[PDB]
Amino acid sequence: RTKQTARKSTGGKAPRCQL
Amino acid sequence: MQIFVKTLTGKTITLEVEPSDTIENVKAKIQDKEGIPPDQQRLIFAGKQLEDGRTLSDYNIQKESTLHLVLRLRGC
């Protein structure tokens, strides 16, 4: 069975956040 | 025996396991069925996160027990 990562999609993010 | 693995969405997976299986083995069977890498998987039973080296017998996980699967999510 093929690899399938568990993920989140970003609904909103503050511009203060760098990564 | 059969156990169930339930995700936070309510999705339920059925596994075939033995009491001597380790949590590590169960994560591999979850990978086999669902494709989720074991390093993403946190398994919880009776309110506590489970340790990879311990067995279902160690935790008294029994026929048709339900484990909770919580994922270390990929995100950007």
Binding site: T2, K3, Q4, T5, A6, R7, K8, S9, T10, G11, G12, K13, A14, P15, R16, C17 | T7, L8, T9, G10, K11, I44, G47, K48, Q49, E51, H68, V70, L71, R72, L73, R74, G75, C76
Partner: protein
């Protein structure tokens, strides 16, 4: 308001601040040992029920109108519960106040499971939402339909790379909307009125994928959708 831009935010008298809340034994998910279970870089992750989001001075606010992107600080209150808990009552929760601010909010649960899950990330913890407070519930409900459509789209594109736009609409039309959304059926316009958000969710989901699994953005379904709806 210089933060906001009408209901107001309240909390039980026994609510505590975020670090004090997170150490309550009701949220202890480990039998601690010498090695640890998680990285120090991983935030603790809990459920949060009876929640409400407000600006730096009192008014209930939405989270999807751009306030977060303008770096306005939205705080939130609610009852934190163990991550596995499916009971949205206050029972067994730990009341928290002025949590956050919200650095990021997100969708997860592209399982094929019933629920769409919404999460908040703070500098202390991550919270998967259960039920809004009665007074925040109108604001939260406004967002629920586009969240759920995004879930269906991502899940259909995951399991039908070789599918076509019309097949995606058939999946949307036959998906029974979950309770509390108070709709009989999704329709093709349910997708089109929210097409910019939905497409942004698909591409964000794609971006989070490992550089070795098939994308879902570059599909027949999406390019028809981008064209048919005017998505930038």
């Amino acid at each position: 308001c210089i933060q906001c831009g009408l209901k107001y935010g309240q909390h039980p008298p026994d609510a505590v601040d975020e670090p004090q809340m997170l150490t309550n034994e009701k949220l202890s998910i480990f039998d601690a040992n010498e090695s640890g279970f998680e990285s120090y870089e991983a935030l603790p992750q809990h459920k949060l029920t009876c929640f409400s989001v407000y600006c730096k001075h009192g008014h209930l606010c939405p989270i999807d109108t751009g306030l977060i992107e303008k770096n306005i600080e939205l705080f939130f209150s609610g009852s934190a519960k163990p991550i596995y808990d499916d009971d949205p009552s206050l029972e067994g929760g730990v009341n928290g106040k002025n949590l956050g601010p919200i650095n990021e909010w997100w969708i997860t649960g592209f399982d094929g499971g019933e629920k769409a899950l919404i999460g908040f990330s703070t500098s202390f913890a991550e919270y998967i939402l259960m039920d809004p407070s009665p007074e925040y519930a109108p604001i939260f409900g406004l967002m629920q339909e586009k969240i759920y459509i995004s879930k269906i789209v991502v899940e259909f594109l995951q399991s039908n790379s070789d599918s076509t736009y019309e097949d995606l609409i058939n999946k949307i039309e036959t998906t029974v909307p979950p309770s509390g959304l108070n709709l009989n059926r999704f329709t093709e316009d349910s997708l089109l009125r929210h097409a910019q958000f939905v497409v942004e969710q698909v591409e964000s989901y794609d971006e989070a994928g490992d550089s070795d699994e098939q994308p879902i953005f570059l599909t027949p379904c999406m390019r028809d959708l981008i064209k048919l709806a005017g998505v930038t």
